[PDB]
């Protein structure tokens with residue numbers, strides 16, 4: 001159903017001359033902190049979705065470098081092909097106003113301005129800048145609508161409310177309820193797929209749950225230790241990020257060691273290393289606190305953890321002890337005395353898929 | 368829109384008028400102690416006219432509403448009830464599927480639409496809303512009738528307003544997200560999301576009030592309330608009637624008798640130093656709801672609504688109190704990048720039942 005081809009800039013040029021690619025096109029771009037995958041999507045035979053993209057490196061760590069890539073693409077591509085571009089959607093790893101202005105970025109310098117992009121890739125009134133988890137959320141909806149939900153998402157635990165509005169198995173469809181998508185990677189991403197009961201419609205509402213000040217449990221001292229390193233009141237992202245895992249790893253080993261990065265800490269936990277595993281537990285404990293607060297504030301039917309990080313950490317979630325402690329923490333809220341946290345079904349992405357690119361495409365269709 | 372409070376019998380009379388011979392919407396605004404229910408019509412020159420009767424919630428039970436509906440059906444002509452084409456009520460609790468009103472703080476039982484009479488609640492044209500979901504539909508109704516500056520006053524203009532809108536702050540809702548806060552008996556919250564893709568606003572219900580409060584430099588003050596409640600304080604615990612009483616008891620330290628919220632507000636309006644200090648403290652946690660939500664939800668506007676807000680006008684007009692409220696709304700680590708400054712704050716400056724306007728507007732989107 002879901003098809004993405006990674007190619008060099010030149011292989012892409014040739015692929016598009018195929019009679020298969022002689023149809024209407026959407027320009028799409030998934031932009032992250034290091035790299036960006038940009039290219040073209042078509043509708044395929046038997047209702048399928050086929051994309052071809054090339055990887056660019058964000059060498060300059062500047063969001064305005066994207067313009068170069070667009071121009072590079074327009075010249076180095078045949079006009080016949082560009083003429084079939086009927087819609088243009090990219091995502092960026094920051095907050096976006098009016099689908100047009102991508103806001104201050106943690107990693108990257110500058111501001112994403114739709115009005116500076118070339119109209120041959122971004123047709124007026126048929127183009128948009130999304131936040132990366134806005135795109136993610138359109139992706140989750142694309143997966144549900146293509147009926148392959150259980151191919152790509154696995155249930156972590158079923159909540160109370162699932163059977164009250166759905167008779168199908170948990171994880172077989174997104175559900176006629178709000179879905180909160182959380183992407184713990186470089187940054188902590190969050191979007192709310194709102195469910196409008198009047199018209200049974202799902203709508204993607206971007207969030208910045210990651211930049212909320214962390215509320216206390218019994219961790220006052222642990223929060224204050226990071227407060228004194230950052231010289232900032234910790235937010236969720238400070239505890240649930242690359243930097244966050246490093247922090248938990250430094251707090252566990254209780255002494256100087258030679259450097260290991262988040263990457264190295266994950267690799268070590270997958271090899272059975274006690275200390276790295278305790279770092280991952282700690283990380284997942286703050287991730288579940290984002291969930292318990294948001295389970296009350298936003299009343300989701302489902303919470304879905306998405307991204308490469310989540311798929312690559314499958315070793316962590318398969319362990320039923322890790323899952324049991326995550327679940328205990330997801331219920332660790334005063335409002336659990338009335339069942340609010342128990343209501344919620346948690347899922348995780350269990351198979352690699354660029355949600356963001358599928359989401360840029362679904363967004364292009366609604367436009 | 369014109370509303371009129373009448374006894375059960377006068378209501379019966381008014382509807383026999385040839386003026387009320389037209390298609391009707393049933394509406395109900397249900398609160399802690401009372402409920403206003405009746406009928407809305409479209410008038411000549413696009414006017415909007417409503418007629419309701421008051422009921423008291425003697426039982427403090429949500430299921431008593433059924434009686435009121437039955438009482439209305441018998442004591443009304445069949446001719447009249449037959450012109451009911453839509454049915455919308457609001458309740459002071461969280462609602463799933465527009466049909467089931469979840470456990471309530473103030474009242475016993477569960478609001479089930481499926482138990483209401485179809486004569487007032489036509490299938491597929493009826494809904495139970497949360498009180499601030501209704502409030503949100505109201506704010507939209509006021510904006511669309513071009514009288515936004517009649518009912519709302521700017522407290523301060525944020526930096527995002529002039530990019531998104533060329534009309535004056537407070538003259539329209541805005542093509543952006545509006546977070547509506549109702550600090551009354553309970554703390555109400557809803558988010559009027561603005562779709563970029565289409566210029567459509569949708570009301571997203573929230574329970575911001577029940578989130579655990581994140582600290583500033585107030586660990587001891589939070590812990591004082593922690594020890595009285597035997598629960599981790601949430602925003603509602605600090606920003607409610609119980610909240611005001613707490614702030615007052617802390618100010619006096621047993622120097623003076625205890626007080627109701629009503630009493631405390633009356634005294635601050637008369638210039639009582641202690642009561643004023645209690646109101647500052649209350650407004651300090653209200654602005655923390657706003658600063659945390661300004662990051663999480665990225666609103667263009669925050670609007671404070673309700674009789675409470677209108678009746679406390681004296682508090683917001685004092686430029687000292689407003690300057691300190693503003694300082695506190697910017698009290699957030701993410702202000703170093705402008706996020707809290709983005710947001711325009713307004714207050715309801717003239718009485719209006721937003722919820723009843725909202726039940727009606729909701730009905731229109733349904734029929």
Ligand SMILES: O=C(N[C@@H]1[C@@H](O)[C@H](O)[C@@H](CO)O[C@H]1O)OCc1ccccc1
Nearest residue numbers: 093094095104105106133187188189190
């Ligand atoms: O950038 C964002 N927030 C971004 C989110 O938009 C994004 O979804 C997430 C996943 O990529 O990373 C967060 O860091 O916040 C603005 C900000 C935060 C911190 C410093 C500067 C700017």
Ligand SMILES: O=C(N[C@@H]1[C@@H](O)[C@H](O)[C@@H](CO)O[C@H]1O)OCc1ccccc1
Nearest residue numbers: 459460461470471472498499553554555
């Ligand atoms: O009742 C609600 N929350 C209600 C809100 O829905 C409502 O909008 C607000 C103003 O009317 O009061 C809150 O208290 O939460 C569930 C709850 C909270 C505390 C104890 C029991 C149940």
